[PDB]
Design an enzyme around this catalytic site. Structure first.
Site, mmCIF file in Angstrom:
data_model
loop_
_atom_site.group_PDB
_atom_site.id
_atom_site.type_symbol
_atom_site.label_atom_id
_atom_site.label_comp_id
_atom_site.label_asym_id
_atom_site.label_seq_id
_atom_site.Cartn_x
_atom_site.Cartn_y
_atom_site.Cartn_z
ATOM 1 C CG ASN A 379 14.782 8.816 48.887
ATOM 2 O OD1 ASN A 379 15.468 8.116 48.148
ATOM 3 N ND2 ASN A 379 13.628 9.325 48.509
ATOM 4 C CB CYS A 381 11.912 8.019 46.305
ATOM 5 S SG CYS A 381 10.178 8.542 46.356
ATOM 6 C CD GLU A 383 15.419 9.833 45.401
ATOM 7 O OE1 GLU A 383 14.369 10.308 45.951
ATOM 8 O OE2 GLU A 383 16.562 10.348 45.455
#
Ligand code: DTP
Ligand code: DTP
Ligand code: MG
Ligand code: MG
Lengths: 692, 692
Positions: A379, A381, A383
């Site tokens: 993703n 991010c 994570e």
């Protein structure tokens, strides 16, 4: 009181940014800003109804709240709760947590001139919403959120129960197959998702390399870049309402022929038409690549074109590590070569100048992954980490076979606050239920493959915030053997309860996530890891805490006991935890973002009419500053260290940022990454170089 | 002959570019280049089989020809024709017409080393293909093409009957509705169509203006530009095989709020991210706009956003002219204002520096349009003009209602050659059949709305080339009263036969184009125009020609007679003619591109290994040069003049280019356009400023 003075809560706030001849902060000046806030701005602009009852009526009648939610409970209960809530005695702890929530969360009147909600209200509708009419649940979500124990993802907290509303989910991961349709779908999917504020990351790794064939005539494919270009423009066009710039990301496998042209879209001294200004980059790196760079060897880049032809699978799906040699032997698979060392070199320089290439340690990941299939992307991010599967089209873009893509629904616990109610199991259970609900009610219409995914996987992202905050309170020091001990055991105990809960839902609902049978959950190995030992409070202080709390550490009896329910009953969610960073909520929930040291004692934000707004960290007082050292001051090792400890248990990932001084060297960076890799870390987020 | 010399047909060709002390050209040196060509390059690399029979066998067996076509006739006939063809005694007339066809058309061996076809072959398979197994037809198409009378569009001539092949159609017109889906579809459709070499033009005019609302919150829509940006990148990415740069075009209505930002993507001294380098621009201009600019008034630009809200139709669909005043009165429709004069001013400057904004005279067009509905956009060559209709989507991009879009299948007649076979009616009929076939076999899978369109409309584009060529031969002078007389009458007589043919197919096939009943064909007015008079050879020389040819000019008896069949039987095609420019085929067919004066006596192309290749115009000899004046030399008026005469009859459009000297002034340009407008012209293509 009665006829008081000083009503500038912005100024009061400011005082938080003064040091007295002795290097102490006037924490109290902040508290004053709160009082002044409510006093001079919240209340006077907050609408007050005769009764709750009349209030909803109105809110429904003028189309603010959604009557559909209320319609699943007896109004009286909807009245009892609004009451419970308002009587739980919640205050905000910081001039920004308040300020944040009323300038960006609480419901206001269409014309923007009056507040219509207060935290409790918001907590309440959220609870009501997720609870889906199950009253005791609804109560509990209320409780957990009010206590500070739980904090659902922004999209959720923000939209649950409102009438005019966005969706409850916001980061998304799509894959692209190697053909025009899949591409048009990608570009499209980007448009649709982004228009509604979603983060979307695409997997580029299957695309045929620059210079590959098309319809059998040599030298013709033009690589991935013109595709980044499109996604890029898509995102830039379909930003969300009230923002310029959407948020896109692409990941490319490191052993893929375009990898260099790929990184190259970020080197500022460049060309035009080859310059990507708003996509995020992510690189997937398998182990060999390290093995290579170690003995200063040559990286071999394989053609996805060829691979597909010879193996009946797309680059994005095979195991590079396990097939490196096999591949270099197959003369039917073209190879290019680059200097690994020079590769990581390039990597780091970019990270240095622009924070990116996210890194996803392909091998660590797939190897710890309990779920059938490989994991090939991540993703925006870094994570989320989950299997996905290809989708197929008919010439008209109609699906002929809908694969599975990944959407992600998160929420977090404030470690501190959890350690504070001996009833940990309830806390975990609710959250999981809460989260699961987000999933169930989710049904992304415009990207069939995403909807399919969710429905099949019921995948959620339970995560944590406030690690530092806690440790600090308990006078432990970020990074410390104790700390390490603590974070390992905690994530240890959390994990036990979530599988347990997911095991429960399984039973309650008569079903499990698709493909469970193939999981390591089905055959039990998942637990092997918890059947040996290690599960014994190394530090004394740690054993202590857990007792002065009433938390029982799962015991070989429990695991062995839990393992049999699963093999007998399965679990509802394919994926339980994920530890994202915690954006502005944190300030509301009063936590330290995620599990990583505090970026500053007095955090400063470029927000509001004053210019800035100051945020003092949780539990921090002039008598404990020495327990608040910047992440910069703590440094990479220690951070890499904590996150590992959390990695033996988190089934997805944890956004990990390394903070460096502005004199760090790419080698410096490079080392850190290595430490990270040798240490178990599944993925690496950003490298921040301290700056003003 | 036997042991000859000089085998450089490139050099021989070159000689065409020398003038002797008396300004005469050695035309013969060209002829020599031909002989040398075949002699030294065609034959030696042309494959020769034992018999036709064995030939196909092979060609089928190794997957060159498509056995599917042959399978609809008795092989013997497929053998008889290949024979007829090769015995019709066709030679090429120019070193380039040959050179062109063997370097870009004739079938070669997969490895590129040997020719496998010759014209006749190509003519043949084309004939076979279109004929769809109807033998007499098949013969005729053969004849017409071999004589030079007919010349199907490149895509067709090039691909008919081959195995590995593109589609038979290549320019496309799509519309975009005002919403993300329709947009994603557009971007997609561009990708898919372009990947296979298509020209696509989109209608931007319905999109909500820069600064319009979205989900009811003021100032948010970002206009059309970021959408051009996408299309732009799409086209640039999905070019055809063997080319960089796709070919896109967009049209925007002149009274649309973004019109200036629109033109502005072409003004070189500009900004970045707002710079469109490969889209073609087209502007639609209604009459009022002239009326406005005339009295130096103010143009009012209306919001599509508002229009939609208040009228239940999209900007792209209402009649601006007829609703100008009404609209300025409706305060529920926002208005912006710009100086018409300054508008046309801007227009011309752009045209001057870059050849574009195509212009489509909305009003002239819709007013002459016999078909129900309005016409709101045009092709990348500005000659197609047809009603279209909106398409609707489901959230997943699945259509819920498939509208109609425009695809275009053309072919042309070489005027000269037609005037040369007294049997005009056969010539027209075949062509129409031929063309209609292209349509019938066409079924564009990837843009449902296009397929629907075709199927419904059976719309074709019969067109013409060689006007100058002819007139010249007959010693008439481009532009002349005689010329004018000729072109009017001819297009007059052609039109009679096509409606007639379409009337026939109607009967033969038991059906008509959808919506016929609403047409002006149904109620007969279509003919009113031909029921008065005007149809009487003004010039003597013209009446002459038609007789020395045996062509009978349709007589009031015929029209009145034709009009009754239609009202009784309808026609199969919604649209008969369209006069596009004639790219490189012309050189093959040996014509003068379209109906517009010859761009040069010896045309020069930047092609082949020598650098250039010289093309002498048809029928031109040292004793008639004074009948070959450049279009530059003839000048705009005269050209505008001819095309009008052709416009009282062509039911679609005619690509019209104005050639200007490099000292012309925007006012100069501007005037021309006006002449054009006052004169009936439906649309304006490019303005070429003479250059090197
Ligand atoms: N026409 C094109 N222009 C630019 N890029 C293209 C084009 N066609 C294909 N590509 C690239 C994009 C995809 O990565 C890959 C496959 O596209 P696709 O439509 O599946 O090709 P294809 O089926 O026609 O060719 P192939 O037989 O090689 O797979 O090729
Ligand atoms: N989120 C967005 N970001 C950028 N442009 C947008 C966005 N949404 C819409 N547009 C532009 C593109 C279209 O011209 C027009 C309509 O898009 P559409 O999806 O139909 O809007 P909408 O239905 O959400 O809003 P509305 O209620 O105003 O029609 O708005
Ligand atoms: Mg393919
Ligand atoms: Mg809309």
């Amino acid at each position: 009181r009665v006829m008081q003075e000083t009503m500038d809560y912005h100024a009061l706030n400011a005082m938080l940014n003064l040091y007295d001849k002795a290097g102490h902060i006037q924490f109290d000046k902040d508290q004053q800003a709160i009082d002044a806030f409510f006093a001079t701005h919240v209340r006077p602009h907050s609408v007050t109804f005769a009764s709750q009852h009349e209030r909803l009526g109105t809110l429904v009648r003028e189309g603010y709240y959604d009557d559909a939610v209320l319609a699943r409970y007896d109004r009286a209960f909807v009245l009892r709760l609004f009451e419970h809530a308002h009587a739980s005695g919640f205050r905000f702890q910081t001039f920004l947590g308040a300020w944040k929530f009323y300038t960006s969360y609480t419901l206001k009147t269409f014309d923007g001139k009056r507040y219509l909600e207060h935290f409790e209200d918001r907590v309440t509708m959220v609870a009501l919403t997720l609870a889906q009419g199950d009253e005791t649940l609804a109560t509990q979500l209320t409780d957990e959120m009010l206590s500070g124990r739980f904090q659902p993802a922004t999209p959720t907290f923000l939209n649950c129960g409102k009438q005019q509303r966005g969706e409850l989910v916001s980061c998304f991961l799509l894959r692209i197959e190697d053909n025009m349709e899949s591409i048009g779908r990608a570009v499209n999917s980007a448009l649709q998702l982004s228009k509604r504020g979603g983060g979307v990351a695409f997997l580029l790794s299957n695309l045929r390399e620059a210079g590959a064939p098309i319809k059998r005539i040599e030298n013709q494919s033009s690589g991935v870049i013109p595709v980044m270009k499109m996604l890029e423009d898509a995102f830039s066009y379909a930003n969300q309402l009230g923002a310029r710039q959407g948020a896109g990301a692409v990941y490319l496998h490191a052993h893929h022929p375009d990898i260099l042209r790929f990184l190259d879209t970020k080197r500022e001294n460049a060309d035009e038409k080859i310059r990507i200004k708003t996509l995020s980059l992510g690189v997937v790196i398998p182990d060999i690549t390290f093995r290579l760079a170690k003995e200063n060897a040559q990286m071999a880049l394989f053609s996805p074109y060829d691979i597909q032809r010879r193996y009946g699978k797309p680059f994005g799906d095979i195991a590079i590590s396990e097939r490196y040699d096999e591949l270099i032997a197959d003369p039917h698979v073209r190879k290019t070569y680059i200097n690994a060392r020079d590769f990581f070199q390039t990597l780091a320089e970019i990270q240095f100048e622009s924070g990116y290439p996210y890194i996803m340690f392909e091998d660590t990941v797939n190897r710890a992954n309990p779920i059938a299939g490989r994991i090939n992307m991540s993703n925006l991010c870094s994570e989320i980490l989950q299997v996905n599967s290809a989708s197929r089209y008919d010439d008209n873009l109609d699906y002929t076979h809908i694969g599975h893509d990944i959407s992600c629904n998160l929420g977090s616990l404030n470690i501190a606050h959890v350690m504070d109610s001996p009833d940990i199991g309830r806390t975990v259970e609710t959250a999981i239920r809460g989260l699961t609900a987000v999933s169930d009610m989710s049904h992304i219409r415009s990207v069939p493959s995403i909807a399919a995914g969710n429905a099949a996987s019921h995948a959620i992202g339970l995560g944590q915030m406030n690690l530092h905050g806690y440790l600090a309170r308990e006078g432990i020091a970020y990074g410390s053997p104790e700390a390490l001990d603590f974070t390992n055991l905690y994530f240890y105990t959390i994990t036990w309860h979530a599988v347990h809960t997911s095991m429960r839902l399984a039973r309650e609902r008569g079903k499990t996530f698709a493909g469970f049978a193939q999981s390591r959950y089905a055959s039990g190995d998942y637990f092997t890891q918890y059947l040996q030992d290690d599960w014994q409070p190394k530090t004394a202080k740690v054993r202590a805490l857990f007792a002065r709390s009433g938390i029982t550490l799962p015991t070989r009896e429990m695991w062995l006991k839990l393992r049999d329910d699963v093999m007998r009953y399965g679990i509802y969610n394919q994926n339980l935890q994920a530890v994202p960073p915690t954006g502005s909520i944190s300030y509301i929930n009063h936590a330290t973002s995620s599990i990583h040291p505090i970026v500053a004692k007095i955090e400063i934000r470029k927000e509001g009419k004053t210019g800035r707004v100051y945020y003092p960290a949780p539990f921090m007082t002039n008598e404990n500053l020495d327990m608040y050292q910047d992440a910069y001051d703590i440094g990479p090792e220690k951070i890499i260290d904590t996150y590992a400890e959390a990695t033996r248990h988190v089934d997805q990932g944890l956004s990990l940022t390394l903070f460096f001084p502005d004199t760090a060297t790419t080698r410096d960076i490079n080392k850190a990454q290595i430490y990270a890799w040798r240490k178990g870390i599944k993925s690496l987020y950003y490298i921040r170089l301290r700056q003003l």
